[PDB]
């Protein structure tokens, strides 16, 4: 049965990580991966997380199954984070949240739920997007189409091209929005622009699907949710895939959420029952430990305050690196203006380097970025900045 | 989009659990759920698990993503548990294991992998089976067919009916075998009978899929794997979905494995690459904590010994309950011979009670079993045994 199975192609992200480990050069620099790194180059466990895990170790008396939608508090705290305390959506009970194995699991649960219980055939994502979106939706049998997004001259949101593009989307198509900190570009809509997309989408009949991978990494927890909130104010129906991977540093524990919103509480409950069947036929029920850490942090005043500062420190260190990057490039002699990096948000920026330029940075300089030019800004530190920028300057 | 979505039907397992909690009677007895309970009625965290979690709390310095197939040691220990130390399969490197979110996740990963990379159209499961099998395979677009299994007169494996049934299976159909401790019947093939099924399956061209939910609950870790091993000796190709939920008491942490076996190491690696794409398009990578507990227990002499005794204690307590059940029924006046319970294995037994009898046991007596007559033997204790059996006796 297996004699003739075609190999899965390469995978440059792992390919890059492999090439990076085997690189026996002292001053190699990884900007190619998807996780936060602190000033030291490490992806540490947050102090708040460690305290939560201790508490769970001392107080857990069973590992009995969670319900299909996971820990009730987790869902409640997730809904407040996304929609704000006081949200009519929450008051009217129009939102149901399932705990999922990460943001990816959330996208997959949404994808299966739609493919099986609606007429949805098609999902629109930005060009470029993170490449897993396409594979998740394709697996549930959903076509994926691209909308224009990035302006390559100006390193900016090509808004006219985006709108023009999406006029091709029919009533009943899904349109996926990165809630903040666009992956791979770092370029987000302004509030004025979100508001405009919200109007267009109700007029055209799109089901909005928000992907929140980095809430708290642009300007703050609440600010970063504004776009989603402008849509929430306008729409009867939407879906949110969220991840706690980056903002709690809980990558490997698979801590995410799929949140379903419908016109009313009777409707969301009915729809959600089928979202639960879709979880049931997949991984049955979600993994406790990570989500439990999150719920125990969010629902405790002291731990939440510690965690909010930790999140603020990550956001600011990225912001200082964006600025040190541009300032160091100007003074190592760079033949372009990079101040567009400052206006970009979160862990990622399109550097504007060519695929040949990134290839060269790897081979000559041991500086590793993704083929598209995506850099992880958190991969920069005050110590590796000088040589990072020298190398780039040399390739321009 | 969601206005007209049909509700997911009820769900008696949750329906039963709900009805059981709201039951305000002092002496209610739950035999209806899928988890182990100790003499006290609790589903506790194993001591070995608690020690492993402490160690992880003190030594983990990152939660960075695991690879798509999870923790390498986990896979290695999984393969030894299934195939035995010394297994040629392992020596020849014909087996690849992915860590998965539970046994269910393992079945789903297998289901997607097959639906997408082979001509498999159809999976054969026992009548009866656990009802999640059907939903998992149906979700990946696989037809499910039933093979005969249970002999209702004799409370026995109707082996002639099973073979006769499976002659309808074409070359290239999957046939799912419960490795031990059949759910819901407790009835397993003898070694002689496994050996015979192994021969038939190579002759008919079936892809065997083993589901191991309760390894160590029939007679012992190694004994319980004999059936799988007789198949392994005979086949170039098979798949194993395993779970550590019951044997480590790690239900909510979603600790399982999908193990792929092919004729050779070149082939399994190629096939496994596509199994990994199927994980990638689903939950991306698996949850660390639970599997990490398992690997840290299995690869440490002291902790493994503690855990093996704990597993032996669970198996024996079930065996003592099977015997106390039959002995108490004889002496509370039961109008049938129940000694078939003693020959049944693991947490489950088909009691042979009718759906009307189970309904009555609930309404009159607050004794809760599943509609089919499935009882969880671990739900019995020396304290609830007298009244359990009185109630049954009264309904016969
Ligand atoms: C937009 C977006 N969606 C989903 C995810 C996945 O989150 P989970 O770990 O919760 O499933 C990421 C992570 N981006 C990193 C990891 C990348 O660059 O690959 C992301 O950037
Ligand atoms: C045969 C079988 N397969 C898979 C599973 C699921 O294991 P995971 O929790 O690892 O996904 C179970 C558990 N049986 C119990 C829980 C039941 O009666 O519902 C099972 O009995």
Q: Report which protein residue has its CA nearest ligand 2's atom 3.
A: B213
For helices A47-59 and B47-59, give the axis angle rounded to 10 degrees. 170
CA dist., res. B249 & res. B264, Å (int): 34
Would you call B2 and A281 a contact, using CB atoms and an 8 Å cutoff?
Answer: no
B159 burial type by CB count under 10 A (0-12 exposed, 13-18 middle, 19+ buried): middle
C-alpha Rg value of chain B to the nearest Å: 21
Helices (H), A190-300: 191-204, 226-234, 265-280, 288-298
For helices A159-166 and A191-204, give the axis angle rounded to 10 degrees. 10
CB atoms within 10 A of CB B24: 7
Would you call A254 and B60 a contact, using CB atoms and an 8 Å cutoff?
Answer: no
CA dist., res. B255 & res. A171, Å (int): 41
Q: Which of B51, B67, B105, B283 to mutate to test the interface with A (most CBs of A within 10 A)?
A: B283
Query: Locate tokens 């002092």: which residue?
Result: B26
Question: Ligand 2 centre from B372 Cα, in Å?
Answer: 17
Q: What are phi and psi of B74, to 5 degrees?
A: -60, -50
Question: Ligand 1 centre from A8 Cα, in Å?
Answer: 21
Whether B69 sits among the annotated catalytic residues: the reply is no
Q: B374 labelled as ligand-binding?
A: yes
Task: List all residues 6 or more positions away from B249 whose beta carbon is below 8 Å from its beta carbon.
Answer: A63, B36, B43, B44, B45, B46, B49
CB atoms within 10 A of CB A221: 19
Q: What is the largest CA-CA distance in chain A?
A: 62
Helices (H), B141-224: 159-166, 191-204
CA dist., res. B77 & res. B299, Å (int): 7
**DSSP for residue A46:** P
Query: DSSP for B76-88?
Result: HHHHHHHH-TT-H
Q: Is B110 helix (H, G, I), strand (E, B) or coil?
A: helix
CA dist., res. A205 & res. A172, Å (int): 6
Q: Is B309 helix (H, G, I), strand (E, B) or coil?
A: helix
CB B237 within 8 A of CB B194: no
Query: Locate tokens 């699907």: which residue?
Result: A209
User: Residue B45 to residues A63, A177, A178, B48, B318: CA-CA distances in angstroms?
Assistant: 6, 41, 40, 8, 18
Residue A395 token pair: 């390739």
CA dist., res. A184 & res. A377, Å (int): 11
Counting ligands in written order, which one lies closest to the CA of residue B131? 2
Q: For chain A, how far is it from start to end, CA to CA, in angstroms?
A: 51
CB atoms within 10 A of CB A64: 18
Would you call A282 and B139 a contact, using CB atoms and an 8 Å cutoff?
Answer: yes
Closest CA to A363 of A33, A41, A34, A28: A28
B301 burial type by CB count under 10 A (0-12 exposed, 13-18 middle, 19+ buried): exposed
Q: Which of A283, A288, A296, A378 to mutate to test the interface with B (most CBs of B within 10 A)?
A: A283
Residue B346 token pair: 């693991």
Compute CA A265 distance to the chain's CA centroid, rounded to the nearest angstrom: 28
Helices (H), A84-158: 88-91, 102-117, 132-139
CA dist., res. A181 & res. A178, Å (int): 7
User: Residue A295 to residues A219, A220, B286: CA-CA distances in angstroms?
Assistant: 23, 19, 20
CB B257 within 8 A of CB B275: no
**DSSP for residue B377:** G
Q: For chain B, how far is it from start to end, CA to CA, in angstroms?
A: 51
Residue B223, sorted as left (phi over 0), alpha (psi -120 to 50) or beta, turns out to be: alpha
Residue A70, sorted as left (phi over 0), alpha (psi -120 to 50) or beta, turns out to be: left
The architecture (CATH level 2) of B45-315 comes to 3-Layer(aba) Sandwich (3.40)
CB B213 within 8 A of CB B243: yes
Task: List all residues 6 or more positions away from B111 whose beta carbon is below 8 Å from its beta carbon.
Answer: B123, B136, B137, B139, B140, B142
- Residues of chain A positioned with their CB less than 8 A from the CB of B105: 282-284
Of B8, B118, B139, the CB nearest to A1: B118
CA dist., res. B332 & res. B390, Å (int): 6
Question: Ligand 2 centre from B327 Cα, in Å?
Answer: 29
Closest CA to A171 of A199, A140, A202: A202
Whether B211 sits among the annotated catalytic residues: the reply is yes
**DSSP for residue A259:** E
**What ranges do the domains of chain B cover?**
11-44+316-396, 45-315
| Residue B135 host element (H or E) | helix B132-139
Closest CA to B380 of B3, B14, B31: B31
| Residue B96 host element (H or E) | strand B95-101
**Resolution of the experimental model in angstroms, please?**
2.3
Closest CA to A240 of A156, A174, A161: A174
Query: DSSP for A63-77?
Result: -----TT--HHHHHH
Compute CA A103 distance to the chain's CA centroid, rounded to the nearest angstrom: 7
Query: Locate tokens 């129906």: which residue?
Result: A237
Whether B246 sits among the annotated catalytic residues: the reply is yes
The active-site residue, picked from B37, B51, B246, B276, is B246
For helices B288-298 and B72-83, give the axis angle rounded to 10 degrees. 60
| Residue B100 host element (H or E) | strand B95-101
CB atoms within 10 A of CB B91: 8
Closest CA to B71 of B53, B98, B33, B48: B98
CB B111 within 8 A of CB B143: no
Residue A10 token pair: 């390469």
Compute CA A394 distance to the chain's CA centroid, rounded to the nearest angstrom: 32
Would you call A284 and B64 a contact, using CB atoms and an 8 Å cutoff?
Answer: no
CA dist., res. B176 & res. B174, Å (int): 6
Closest CA to A49 of A240, A217, A251: A251
**DSSP for residue B143:** E
Closest CA to A315 of A225, A195, A224: A224
Closest CA to B294 of B74, B125, B71, B66: B74
Closest CA to B52 of B215, B250, B313, B258: B250
CA dist., res. B133 & res. B119, Å (int): 19
CB B111 within 8 A of CB B140: yes
CA dist., res. A349 & res. A156, Å (int): 11
Compute CA A198 distance to the chain's CA centroid, rounded to the nearest angstrom: 20
**DSSP for residue B345:** -
**DSSP for residue B225:** G
Query: DSSP for B3-55?
Result: TTPPPPP--HHHHHHHHHHH---TT-EE--SSS---TTS--PPPHHHHHHHHH
Is the link from the previous residue into A128 a cis peptide, with omega within 30 of 0?
A: yes
CB A144 within 8 A of CB A138: yes
Question: Ligand 2 centre from A51 Cα, in Å?
Answer: 32
Q: What are phi and psi of B184, to 5 degrees?
A: -105, 0
Strands B95-101 and B29-30, by their bridges, are: unpaired
Q: Closest Cα of chain A to B54: distance in Å?
A: 7
Q: Which residues in chain A belong to E strands, given as ranges?
A: 29-30, 95-101, 122-126, 143-147, 150-151, 156-157, 174-178, 207-212, 238-243, 255-261, 348-350, 367-368, 374-376
Closest CA to B92 of B258, B243, B232: B232
CA dist., res. B273 & res. B266, Å (int): 11
CB B347 within 8 A of CB B181: yes
Question: In residues, how long is chain A?
Answer: 396
Residue A78 token pair: 């997730």
Task: List all residues 6 or more positions away from B223 whose beta carbon is below 8 Å from its beta carbon.
Answer: none
Cross-strand partners of A95: A261
The alpha carbon torsion through A194, A196, A200, A201 (nearest 10 deg) reads: 20
CA dist., res. A394 & res. A329, Å (int): 11
Of A3, A100, A289, the CB nearest to B253: A289
Q: Which of A45, A111, A289 to mutate to test the interface with B (most CBs of B within 10 A)?
A: A289
CA dist., res. A162 & res. A148, Å (int): 5
Residue A331 token pair: 């003074």
Residue A36 token pair: 């936060």
Closest CA to B118 of A171, A372, A344, A3: A3
Q: Closest Cα of chain A to B393: distance in Å?
A: 31
CB atoms within 10 A of CB A324: 18
Closest CA to A3 of B124, B117, B230, B232: B117
Looking at 3.55.50.30, 3.40.50.10680, 3.90.1150.10, 3.60.21.70, the CATH number of the domain A11-44+316-396 comes to 3.90.1150.10
- 3-state DSSP percent of chain B in helix, strand and coil, to 5: 45, 15, 40
């Amino acid at each position: 049965m297996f004699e003739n199975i075609t190999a899965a192609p390469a995978d440059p992200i792992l390919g890059l990580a492999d090439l990076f480990r085997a690189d026996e050069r002292p001053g190699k620099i990884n900007l190619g991966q998807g996780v936060y790194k602190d000033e030291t180059g490490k992806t540490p466990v947050l102090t708040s997380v460690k305290k939560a895990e201790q508490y769970l170790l001392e107080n857990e008396t069973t590992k009995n199954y969670l319900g299909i939608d996971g820990i009730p508090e987790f869902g409640r705290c997730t809904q407040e984070l996304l929609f704000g305390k006081g949200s009519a959506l929450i008051n009217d009970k129009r939102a149901r949240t399932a705990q999922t194995p990460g943001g990816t699991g959330a996208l997959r649960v949404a994808a299966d739920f739609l493919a099986k219980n609606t007429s949805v055939k098609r999902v629109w994502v930005s060009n470029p997007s993170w490449p897993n979106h396409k594979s998740v939706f394709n697996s549930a049998g959903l076509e994926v189409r691209e909308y224009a997004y990035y302006d390559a001259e100006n390193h900016t949101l090509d808004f006219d091209a985006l709108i023009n593009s999406l006029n091709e989307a029919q009533a009943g198509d899904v349109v996926l929005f990165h809630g903040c900190c666009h992956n791979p570009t770092g370029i987000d809509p302004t509030l004025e622009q979100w508001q405009t997309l919200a109007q267009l989408s109700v007029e055209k009949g799109w089901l909005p699907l928000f992907d929140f991978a980095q809430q708290g990494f642009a300007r703050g927890l609440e600010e970063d949710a504004e776009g989603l909130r402008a849509f929430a104010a306008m729409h009867k129906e939407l879906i949110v895939a969220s991840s706690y991977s980056k903002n709690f540093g809980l990558y490997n524990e698979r801590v995410g959420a799929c949140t379903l919103v419908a016109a009313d509480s009777e409707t969301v409950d009915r729809a959600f029952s089928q979202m639960k069947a879709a979880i049931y036929a997949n991984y049955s029920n979600p993994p406790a430990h990570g989500a439990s850490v999150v719920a125990t942090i969010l629902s405790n005043d002291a731990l939440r305050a510690i965690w909010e500062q930790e999140l603020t420190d990550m956001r600011q260190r990225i912001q200082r690196m964006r600025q040190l990057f541009v300032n160091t490039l100007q003074e190592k002699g760079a033949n372009r203006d990079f101040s567009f990096i400052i206006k970009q948000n979160g862990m990622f920026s399109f550097s504007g380097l060519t695929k040949e330029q990134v290839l060269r940075l790897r081979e000559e300089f041991g500086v590793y970025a993704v083929a598209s030019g995506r850099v992880n800004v958190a991969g920069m530190t005050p110590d590796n900045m000088a040589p990072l920028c020298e190398a780039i300057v040399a390739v321009l």
